[PDB]
Every structure is written in structure tokens, then in C-alpha cells.
Amino acid sequence: PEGPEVALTADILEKYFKGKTLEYIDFISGRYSKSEPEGYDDFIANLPLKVSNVDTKGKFLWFELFDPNDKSNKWYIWNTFGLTDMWSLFEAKYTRAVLSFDNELMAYFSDMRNFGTFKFSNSEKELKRKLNELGPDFLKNDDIDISKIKKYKQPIVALLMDQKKIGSGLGNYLVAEILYRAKIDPHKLGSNLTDQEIENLWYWIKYETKLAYDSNHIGYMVNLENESSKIGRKNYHPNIHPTEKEFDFLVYRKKKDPNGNKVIADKIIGSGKNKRTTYWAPAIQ
DNA sequence: GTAGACCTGGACG
DNA sequence: CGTCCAGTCTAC
16 A cells, blocks of 8 residues: 555544554464564553554554553554555455454454564654654645755656655555656656646645545555545645546556557666566656 | 565466 | 566665
8 A cells, every 4th residue: 555545544543443442462374473573572561552543654654552551651553564455344365463452343454465564662762763764745744845856866756656755655556647647757857857847746746645545445445445435534735626536547557548648567666676667658748 | 776585466378 | 387467675
């Protein structure tokens, strides 16, 4: 999942698990069934704990639990997302984590490719630095100066895939849709962009992130499609109002755009075995 | 810059 | 079966 996806997941987890007391957490399969995550034994020794907040910044989700008996020394459940990471209220396939709340309330975390990570920490100072390793949230933050792109002599598609330089949240399909809407060649360097192109880029960044956030079914939160429709959306980017009721792929994973123009499966970003495919239309971008 | 790996598939010939 | 495709870290 990505920015709008992870953020929406937090909203759902906030709806069902905020104020709820987590008594136990069990990793029944995957990487964390072979080796325990960092700070696991200390976290279990402090259970049960009460969830206070579930907040995100881009592609990083974390729980904030505390003890009614002691308010201080609150714990944090870090959770980075891979490609097939999904939270759920039921034990779906590839269920890697099981969270046992009070009154038989259950939370499940599924991950097929096992690329998602978990980390437990009772330090707030460590969390603040982790968030500072990530750029501004393109979805949740409305005041992001993206004029910093002009300083980089690198492809714009690589700068948007980056999570520290300009901002965090954007993934593979988002940057493909954004660059298409703004009519920008992904090969074009950020230092060659115009002041108008910059202002136009920031618009579509807000447009695509909000549209992907208000959506109910894209294909990366299948375990929460029923919950996405039974919950409202936070008013991120108030001045931006998409026309679509649902996020449709205009150029990502398609032979042609809605107009019929040719779409290239180009490999601009990455090397060796971490190459990524950037879909784009030369007749538009 | 270029290379690999972590892991488990789905879709296609 | 065989071949492509589908977030982030490490190393020369």
C-alpha cells in the first residue's frame, strides 16, 4: 500500500481500536514466526496496554499504547508496509500477525510477500527521528513547498518515489498518474522544471492523493473494502475537489490511455534487481 | 551508477 | 513448467 492507502487504514484502525486495551499480540506465520522483532519481549512484558492513537506519515504506521495505571512510558508499534500488506478484522489468507484486544476483539495483519516490518519501542525520541527520516506527507500536509525539486539534477519520477527529499506517501502507480495529469515527462530533471510546472505539479499531487484516499476499492486494501465504505474521510486538501467518485488508473498498467495514446512500460528507476516500471504517455507527457 | 537480496505469488505462453 | 510482473535495504 501507499500514502492514501496507509492513511485510510489508520482511520479504520482508529475507529475500531482506539481506546481498546491490547492484551496480547501473536505472530503465527512469516518472518516474525522464525525471529522476534526488535523490542518484542519487552512489549509483551508490559501488556496489557491501551491504544491511544493510530497515526501515519506517508508509508509509516505506528500504534501509541499506554497504561491507565501508569500514563508515562508509553509504547509504540512501528509498522512499515511492503507490496502486499493488509490489515483486517478477520483472519484472512497470509495472516502474519494476530492482535488480541479485550472482550474477544481481534485484529489481523496479512502479508503475502513478507516485506512488511514490525518494531516495538518505548522511546518517543526514537520515533521522532524516524519521522524525520521521512519527508512531508503529501496527503495530510497542505503546506508543502515543492520548490526544492529545482535543486535536484535527477528524474522527477525518482524524486517523487523518494520518501525524504521532497515528500513521503507517493508510490509507483501514484507518480505514474500524477506525471500524466501534469503532462510531465518522467525523464525530465527536477532542475529543468518551470515555476509553472512546479505549481501545476503540486496541484495534481494533492489531486491524486486525495482521490486515492476517498476511494473505497483500488486493489490494495481488499481486506478493508467493506470498512472503507462504512467510514468517512478526513478533509485532507480542503480546497481540492476531485470529480471522480473512484480512483481509476489512467496510465498505470495499461496499453493505452483513455484517449488511445501509446503507453510505455519504461524502466527509469532502479538497477540490478530493484528496477521499477514507470508507465507514461509520450503524446501527453 | 550498477548489482544483488528479502518473499510468494498472479498472469501469461 | 517457464517467463515477466508486483517496498526498501545492502554492497562494489
